[PDB]
Design a protein around this nucleic acid. Structure first.
Lengths: 90, 44, 272
RNA sequence: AUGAGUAGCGAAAGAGGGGUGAGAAUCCCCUCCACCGAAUGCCUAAGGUUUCCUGAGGAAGGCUCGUCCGCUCAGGGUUAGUCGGGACCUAAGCCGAGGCCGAAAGGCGUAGGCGAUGGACAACAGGUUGAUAUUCCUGUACCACCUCCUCACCAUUUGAGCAAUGGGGGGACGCAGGAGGAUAGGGUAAGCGCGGUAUUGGAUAUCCGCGUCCAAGCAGUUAGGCUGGGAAAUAGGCAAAUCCGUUUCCCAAAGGCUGAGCUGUGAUGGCGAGCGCGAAGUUCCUGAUUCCACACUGCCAAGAAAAGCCUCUAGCGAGGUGAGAGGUGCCCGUACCGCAAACCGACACAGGUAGGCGAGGAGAGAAUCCUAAGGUGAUCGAGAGAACUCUCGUUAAGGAACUCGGCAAAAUGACCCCGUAACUUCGGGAGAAGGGGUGCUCUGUUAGGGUGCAAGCCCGAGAGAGCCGCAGUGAAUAGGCCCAGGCGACUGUUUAGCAAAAACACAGGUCUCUGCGAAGCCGUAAGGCGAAGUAUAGGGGCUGACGCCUGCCCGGU
RNA sequence: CUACCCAUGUCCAGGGUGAAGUUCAGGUAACACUGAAUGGAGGCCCGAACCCACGCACGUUGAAAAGUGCGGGGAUGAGGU
């Protein structure tokens, strides 16, 4: 699988800015990228030595405006922890 | 009162599922009427 | 023998059980067991096509060779055990080769006796022989009909049968309820009684004890409504309406003989 | 529109003071008094799908207003090697190559594989935010898998090692009942720690408050329960056989498999009453519904399977086995509610919802009655205390006259002790009936028991003494009994949602069908129920335990 | 939902009642027998959870298209889910 096509966006929360001070970085990946891909993505992109990766996946919130009954697409986020004395990323 | 609809999703989608309505010739007509009408929730 | 019960309640009032004097050991070994899906009448059409059966106590089958197809190899009786699924006690003998098989223990066997199943065995209570060597005037059971299939006719407890004549290709056999049967002479039938001799006179007592044996109860004829049974209706315990009391299906059941008249086994039967 | 501002406002204790705000009986605070507590409390399935979180908003959604929320808005919230489920197995049942050569379809037949509520399996204990936590973090471990390697040992053709979709063992199974062993928890019983000695009279320690600890893993150790072992020989385990299986001798305790716990570590930690910090942190007693464990014994209704496992060879075989280092280890489920106001009930409906935990005092009690931890004041109120309605509370004299009828209601109950009729199928009937003593204080840290080494703790038998009230199981709460009578023998079951019985069922009786491809049944064939059964068995009809009994008519059907 | 049925786990507070046996003593030529202790079987008994609807009362444009209240019958087997 091609490495730059795996991720979609980072996550900007209070959980993010707390854990970005804790040498670990959340990432919003697509639905089917496996855990060993996400580990092997970061070193293929940034070369930063990865401790481990944990994967959540949200479900669809019932957002409705006006009349219609849509549901938001699911988001599969991933928490990636880095090794000690590794290079931080913005 | 043990009311008449006691839902349990495994007991539901194995009677009224898509594959369980794909287990005869008569199972296909149930979907065939459900397609030529214009329904959105096709199976249960 | 048969043990009685003093009436601790109105349940165990007339209740008689056996005492299990014969059954020595309680462990049928693992090599001969078998699983039993209980049925109660239904199979893939799911319909109650045998009435009155369902759900007793669960069972694990004990596989018995009624065939006695081992020849010329001396056996030795080791244990006599219980058997749920039939009326008779069974005996686990040990052959010299170690091929452990079950048999039906006749009335008079003990632990540690010898049984030869070979075709030229000495006649003794428990042995297995073909019919041509067996003489007229002996007590015969495990009688089979098609040669080498395995024991067919006199197999349940308390029972026996008897040879009457040795024509040649046929063998005269007297069965229980006195029926005379011509039998193919290449069948292997064992020699002896069958060894309970008290399974009839077991006064059950409860209704719960003869549910445990896999019986569900029996509603009468003149109680069901006139579509569900052809006796019923009537304004209260009404008599047998239709002449010659019919079954719940359209057949009478008093004197109405039900063999195929053009049965292929006419040649083999003399009396009934 | 009408009824008419009329019925209803869905069980339940709040009142007051501050705060917010235009507005507040309701919203937010504190204070007490409230209510459940074998549940109105914590975990977790089924399901629910964003309700959970914080920040604003009050047009509607709450049977009422409302500043608030299960509502409407913008943000934010679930992290696994291990358990929950997959890549592990398998029953029920189903799907089903061919084949069974089916008025078209099509039930689906073994092979084969689905399918768990089963078996199998590696992980816990402490913090932590406004939401996740046997996943995050900090500690401390294991589990299979792989050598970039390092050490070992053995052997490269009797050549070490591997061990199979094959063989065998083992996994591997129920119900009651009772010791024994240990433990969660419980007592604060002693001792210790810390805090306080009060102003309502008294009590400086003779008193009071609160706290009186810790796994998994590893190392040993153990209550016990199982099971005879050795050696030769093999018509067997489709071939193979050292393993089993039998068969002969030789010894009758050893051995093995097993294990709840125990102690050492783990702990030069972490919790811990208390004010980011942190003390003591023992011993005794009580004692299971959980653990040894279906382990034992007994009864009879005779109590799944296959795979991990272990072993046997077949067969594989030139580098392997052991240890240490280093390394890999995936997807789902994870929020929140889960006796509920987030589910089923048209609703924020007095209903229903499997499972694990289940506190003290009296008590046998999971009864009841207040209470702990913890949760709640539940969504209309205030004000007069009316006819009437209901659930409730008392009635002097009277007791069934009331009435279809003792329907209803009171009366009885607890435990100990004395006493018990007719009949009886000798089991019962019987707790028959009929009455009696129950509290407190003293002889008593009792006679006596348990427990311990003693010290001390629990269990409290009988009496004597005496004080008390009307009463003495003072509260709650747990049989009303006796005489006959038919009908059903009996416990059982149905008229979900009018009708619980005198009906059905029932054991036993009984006549008859039916020789095994039984009969009967499903239904035009098959196929595999009956039955891995075989006249001491299986369908069918007729009655209803037992005891005494079952007579007459074969003309018509 | 329900009616039975099929494989599968699971739950049932305590107290009473005491047979078949067993052993000991006595007894008999010896079994019958007798008395103690033990042992504990039961569609056994009383009573919670839990099922279940009998008897009245309440309800009946009900809290509820079948309930709650005060009591009731089974509650280790033909049992409950």
């Amino acid at each position: 699988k091609d490495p730059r096509d795996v991720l979609k966006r980072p996550v900007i929360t209070e959980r993010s800015a707390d854990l970005m001070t804790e040498k670990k970085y959340t990432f919003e990946v697509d639905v089917r990228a496996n855990k060993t891909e996400v580990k092997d993505a970061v070193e293929s992109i940034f070369g930063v030595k990865v401790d481990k990766v944990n994967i959540m996946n949200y479900k669809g919130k019932s957002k409705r405006v006006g009349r219609y009954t849509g549901m938001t697409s699911r988001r599969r986020k991933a928490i990636v922890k880095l090794t000690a004395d590794s290079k931080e990323i913005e | 009162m043990k009311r008449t609809f006691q839902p349990n999703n495994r007991k539901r989608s194995k009677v009224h599922g898509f594959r369980s309505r794909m287990s005869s010739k008569n199972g296909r007509l149930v979907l065939a009427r459900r397609r030529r009408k214009g329904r959105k929730v096709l199976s249960a | 023998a048969i043990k009685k019960y003093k009436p601790t309640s109105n349940g165990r009032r007339g209740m008689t059980t056996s005492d299990f004097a014969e059954i020595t050991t309680d462990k049928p070994e693992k090599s001969l067991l078998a699983p039993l899906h209980k049925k109660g009448g239904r199979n893939n059409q799911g319909k109650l096509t045998v009435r009155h059966q369902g759900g007793g106590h669960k069972r694990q089958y004990r596989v018995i060779d009624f065939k006695r197809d081992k020849d010329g190899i001396p056996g030795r009786v080791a244990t006599v055990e219980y058997d749920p699924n039939r009326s008779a006690n069974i005996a686990l003998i040990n052959y010299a080769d170690g091929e452990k098989r079950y048999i039906l223990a006749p009335k008079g066997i003990q632990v540690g006796t010898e049984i030869m199943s070979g075709p030229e065995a000495d006649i003794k209570v428990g042995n297995a022989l073909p019919l041509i060597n067996i003489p007229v005037g002996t007590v015969v059971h495990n009688i089979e009909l098609k040669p080498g299939k395995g024991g067919q006719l006199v197999r349940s407890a308390g029972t026996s049968a008897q040879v009457l004549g040795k024509e040649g290709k046929y063998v005269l056999v007297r069965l229980n309820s006195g029926e005379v049967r011509m039998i193919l002479s290449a069948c292997r039938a064992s020699i002896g009684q069958v060894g309970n001799e008290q399974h009839e006179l077991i006064n059950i007592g409860k209704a719960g004890r003869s549910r445990w044996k896999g019986i569900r109860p029996t509603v009468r004829g003149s109680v069901m409504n006139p579509n569900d049974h052809p006796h019923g209706g009537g304004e209260g315990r009404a008599p047998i309406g239709r002449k010659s009391p019919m079954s719940p299906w359209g057949k009478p059941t008093l004197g109405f003989k039900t063999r195929k008249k053009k049965n292929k086994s006419d040649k083999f039967i003399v009396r009934r």
